[PDB]
Design a protein around this ligand. Sequence first.
Ligand SMILES: CC(C)CS(=O)(=O)NCc1cccc(-c2ccc3c(NC(=O)C4CC4)n[nH]c3c2)c1
Ligand SMILES: [Cl-]
Length: 302
Amino acid sequence: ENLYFQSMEKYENLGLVGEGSYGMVMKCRNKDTGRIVAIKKFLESDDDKMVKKIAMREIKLLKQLRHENLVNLLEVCKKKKRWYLVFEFVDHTILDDLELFPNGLDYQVVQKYLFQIINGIGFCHSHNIIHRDIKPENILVSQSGVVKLCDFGFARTLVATRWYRAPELLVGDVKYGKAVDVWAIGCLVTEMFMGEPLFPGDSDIDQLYHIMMCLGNLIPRHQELFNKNPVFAGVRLPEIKEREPLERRYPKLSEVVIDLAKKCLHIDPDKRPFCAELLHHDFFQMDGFAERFSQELQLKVQ
Ligand SMILES: CC(C)CS(=O)(=O)NCc1cccc(-c2ccc3c(NC(=O)C4CC4)n[nH]c3c2)c1
Ligand SMILES: [Cl-]
């Protein structure tokens, strides 16, 4: 179809990005233009016509996912029978800012970051794409403060921190949906403002304890799935008789912020707001921040 390959000869491999965290993604310099890029091996051999078919479907989708708040595909290169995808390289993550401000970020800074994260995730959701692994490491930040989300999870293409995982993911619900990303965003609301993870569990069951001692008992579906899931070895969930609400843990946080977080962190995934509804929240709409920042975000056009 419409897919033409560039050359790997112009790139110099400077090493793996993020000390190898995101896998075999190579930080590369384009020796023709000086641009720095992120290159991932994509296909081991285009000799297999079936693997080739699947690969071109994915490239077609990656091209449709061009957005100011996503790491974008720049080109595809071919070396021998291998394919490589070239994406943008972004220098910093939101971790760098959290490390500078360990007692919480500035209010407007959180507005700008969350607006962009929700904008980027909402765009993917409109293409029926779920990230499923939002965390500070995957939220890149350009020198200009433009957020670029990276490492989305793609279906039909075929240890890790659990702090941002929704209850449906923890209990093994295969009917999870876009609401898992909204849960992850709600986890980031309090983290950015307070300088500490909301639910820093060290196992799936420990993560569930963190969540429910704050937010209460799970919906019936998730308790039943938990009881059937063999990874929990017949163990049973705790019964919450007096949760500790977010505003009790963080009594200084504004009502508007606690409302935003509570909505994203609804125990029932179906009662969480969509990403678009999140941008209409008072947190973003008060004093016309959304209008102003939306036009301000024309630093995307350099
Ligand atoms: C959005 C769309 C749906 C495509 S995708 O994001 O889902 N797939 C492409 C993909 C897959 C896996 C990893 C990456 C990746 C990771 C990191 C960076 C980066 N900076 C850094 O690591 C700095 C040291 C912190 N610059 N560029 C990157 C790219 C990208
Ligand atoms: Cl609460």
